[PDB]
Amino acid sequence: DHYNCVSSGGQCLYSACPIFTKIQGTCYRGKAKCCK
Numbered sequence: 442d443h444y445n446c447v448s449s450g451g452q453c454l455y456s457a458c459p460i461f462t463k464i465q466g467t468c469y470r471g472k473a474k475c476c477k
Contacts, residue, residue: 443468444475451477 444466446452453468458476468475 446475446477449477451475 443453446465446468451462453473453475455473457474458464462476464474464476466475467473
């Protein structure tokens with residue numbers, strides 16, 4: 442289940458978090474991780 446990412450200001454990326462963010466959970470089925 443898409444974790445509350447974009448809600449506050451996050452995005453899903455197939456690879457590890459880009460900027461100095463931190464991945465909390467997973468976005469889609471599990472191909473992308475939710476970061477914020």
